[PDB]
Every structure is written in structure tokens, then in C-alpha cells.
Amino acid sequence: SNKFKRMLNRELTHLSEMSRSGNQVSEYISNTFLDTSISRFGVNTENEDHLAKELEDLNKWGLNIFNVAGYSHNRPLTCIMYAIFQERDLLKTFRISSDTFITYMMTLEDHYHSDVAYHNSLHAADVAQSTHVLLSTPALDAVFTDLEILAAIFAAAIHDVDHPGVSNQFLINTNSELALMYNDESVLENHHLAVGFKLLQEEHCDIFMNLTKKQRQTLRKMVIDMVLATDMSKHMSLLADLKTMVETKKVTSSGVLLLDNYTDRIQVLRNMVHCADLSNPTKSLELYRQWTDRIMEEFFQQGDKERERGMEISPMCDKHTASVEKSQVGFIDYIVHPLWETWADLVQPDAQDILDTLEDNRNWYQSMIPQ
């Protein structure tokens, strides 16, 4: 659609001229978004009661994933994934032993880096838990098969495995081996998928051993589609497709969405995990503020690596010139809010408290803008 494209670049030109704040946010958007305990929980802990209290939020959008990390000896991913699989009865359905499951989930957690401020197992655990809540949205809850539920949640788990804490564009600009291996197109996301699936081959880790061949093939395609869709530069095209889907949606009976073909189904799932990935500003302000401070830490360190190298500092990576408050407002106004508004429309009446929390958070960061 040339109209949407013409409209997009208009919206960003105007922002780019509002102020130097808007220029830095507008440069960022274009370069980013455009093309008993070990079996009770998955984990050893002598805090079984504090952990059991936190995990009562398993199905709530307000689950505090930071506290889970605290009471799980810093295994928020293994712990949450075990909880989701118990909750949805996925181990039994797919004949996965708890043993194989925990060994895989520990190996996966281990390949997330804890020295990366944001793209580490905590973020993986949050995105997986948020996907778990989203899959229970009433308009979809009856729609997806368990194979699709498994694919989505696994997708979420692995979606950033082995992330180094720098962007696809830095990896291309520094001529990384990874950029070289994947020919500059979706560098990290291809890698996340490779690692996640490669790890099944490790000893006692094939959590899909007991699926049929046709099941494995369907899972793998679904998962590849979802993770490649977390590539941020695909954001505008994903939102375009979601909007056209809203305007031509079919409700069946009792509020449920009609998704006949594979295309319709994967489009929704991949927007779902994409939404999970951008759910930080829709969570409670305590949660959201921690996430912001982490991503900025990570952007700033990329900025220093650029500076060490004599490269030009990327937008939002200069610690000496960021405006974190104005940037958050822009990010909500121009990316998070449009995406979540469209999602709310697809799945109405759901997502509305999510949308209201999003405005509170946005208004809090506005209230904190000096001058």
C-alpha cells in the first residue's frame, strides 16, 4: 500500500522537525522498526513459599518476573516455562519427561547471557509468560491447537537466545561473523533460531522426541515464522497486515475469531509474540521502569563499543545525549500504542486495561519530562 507508506514517512518527518528530541526519536524509529521443589517447580529453591506466591500470578498480566528470578535462584525461564507447561498440561499431551524438559530449559537459560542488561533469560521469561496470558485472550482461547500453543510458547522462550546485546545494524557495521554468516538479513533472529533448535541435540534435551514427523515439521515452520517476525525492522509490515485483518475479521460464535487458513492463523500468532516482545510499557510502572533502565543500559553500552571503535554513535546509544523520558513517550505514541490499539480492536473487548495502563505509564513519563 503506497498510502500507508506515504503516511508513515509523513508522520515521521513531522516528528523529526518538532524538536531535536523528536529528530533523535524519529531517526531511531526509521533505523529500527522499518524495512519436593525440583518437581513442584522446575528448579531447586529453599524459598518454596515465596516462589509459590509469585507463581499464583502465572495467568495474570501483572506477574512480577523479577521476584520469580529472586526466589528461583535466578532461573526465571526454567521456572516459568515449567509452570506454563504444567498449567496447560503440555508435558503430558506431548509425552515430554520432566527430566528432558528441565535439562533443555537449563541449557537454554544458560545460553542467554547475564552480562547483557536486557536481552537475557529474564526478558525471555517475561515474553514467554506474557505470550501465555495473551493465548488466553477470550477471542482466541478456543482457536489454537496445542501444537500451536506449544510452538508459540517455545518460540517466546528461545526468541533471543545467545543475544550479544548489540543490534543487527552494529553487527553489520562491524562486519561480524554472524552478519557474514546470515548475509545482513535478520542476523540475530536467524541465530536465535539456530541455537534454540541446535540445543535439542544436546544430551537429554529433545523435548520434541515424542512428536510425529508431521508435528515436528509443522512446529518448526510455525516457530521459524514467529521468531523471524520478532525482527524489529518488520514492525510496520506486521502492523499493516494486522490492520487489514481487523477491517476484514470474521467472528464465529460466542466472540471467537474465525481463522480458517494457515496464513490467518500464523499472522495472529506472530503478532501475538511480537506484542509480547513489546509489552514492557503496558505492565505496571514498577515493572516497566526496570525494563526501561535495562534497555537503556544496553543501548548505552553498544554506544560505548561504537565509540571505542571510532564509529558513529547510533541513535539512543549516547549516554551523554539521551532523553529517556521524551523517548519513552515517543516510543509509546508512535510504536507501542498503535500496535496495542490495533490488537485491542482485533480481540475486543479484551486488552482494554492493558491499554489504560499504557496511558498511565505514558503520562507518568510525560509528567517527568523536565521543561
Ligand X SMILES: O=[N+]([O-])c1cccc(-c2cc(Cc3ccncc3)cc3cccnc23)c1
Active site residues: 119
Tell me: does residue 189 bind Zn ion (CB under 5 A): no
Mark 253-292 with x for binding to ligand X (rule: CB under 6 A) and - for no binding.
Answer: ---------------------------x----------xx
Q: Interface residues for ligand X in 308-367 (CB under 6 A)?
A: 316, 327, 330-331, 335
- For the CA atoms of 138, 139, 140, 142, the dihedral, rounded to the nearest 10 degrees, stands at 70
> Residue 64 and residue 55: Cα distance in Å, rounded?
9
Out of 15, 16, 28, 182, name the contact with ligand X by CB under 6 A: 28
Distances (CA, A) of 36 to 39, 42, 46, 86, 137: 6, 10, 10, 15, 33
Helix (H) or strand (E) run with residue 250 in it: none
Is 331 known to sit in a ligand binding site? Answer: yes
In the bound complex, what is the minimum distance in angstroms from residue 277's beta carbon to Zn ion?
4
Q: Interface residues for ligand X in 59-98 (CB under 6 A)?
A: none
Is 159 known to sit in a ligand binding site? Answer: yes
Q: Interface residues for Zn ion in 237-296 (CB under 5 A)?
A: 277
> What's the 3-state SS for 132-177?
HHHCCCCCCCCCCCHHHHHHHHHHHHHCCCCCCCCCHHHHHHCCCH
Q: How many residues bind Mg ion (CB under 5 A)?
A: 2
Tell me: does residue 46 bind its own copies (CB under 8 A): yes
Out of 109, 160, 189, 350, name the contact with Zn ion by CB under 5 A: 160
Is 41 known to sit in a ligand binding site? Answer: no
Q: Which of 107, 96, 98 is nearest to 158 (CA)?
A: 107
Is 24 known to sit in a ligand binding site? Answer: no
In the bound complex, what is the minimum distance in angstroms from residue 253's beta carbon to its own copies?
48
For residue 226 the three cell numbers come to 514467529
Residue with cell 528470578: 69
CB atoms within 10 A of CB 304: 13
Report the largest interatomic distance among the alpha carbons of the chain, rounded to a whole angstrom.
61
Q: Interface residues for Mg ion in 220-279 (CB under 5 A)?
A: 230
Tell me: does residue 160 bind Mg ion (CB under 5 A): yes
**What letter represents residue 101's amino acid?**
F
| Residue nearer to its own copies on the CB measure, 133 or 317 | 317
Tell me: does residue 170 bind its own copies (CB under 8 A): no
Long-range contacts of 315-319 (CB under 8 A, 24+ apart): 315/24, 315/27, 315/28, 315/31, 316/24, 316/28
CA angle, 273 then 274 then 278, to 5°: 110
User: Which of ligand X, its own copies, Mg ion, none does 71 bind, CB closer than 5 to 8 A by kind?
Assistant: its own copies
Cβ-based neighbours of 349, under 8 Å, separated by 6 or more? none
Q: Which stretch binds its own copies (CB under 8 A): 88-96, 126-134, 320-328, 358-366?
A: 320-328
CB atoms within 10 A of CB 364: 15
Q: How many residues bind Zn ion (CB under 5 A)?
A: 2
Residue numbers of the site for its own copies (CB under 8 A)?
46-47, 49-50, 70-71, 73-75, 114-115, 300-301, 304, 319-322, 324, 370-371
Binding residues: 119, 123, 159-160, 277, 328, 331
Binding residues for AMP: 119, 123, 160, 277, 328, 331
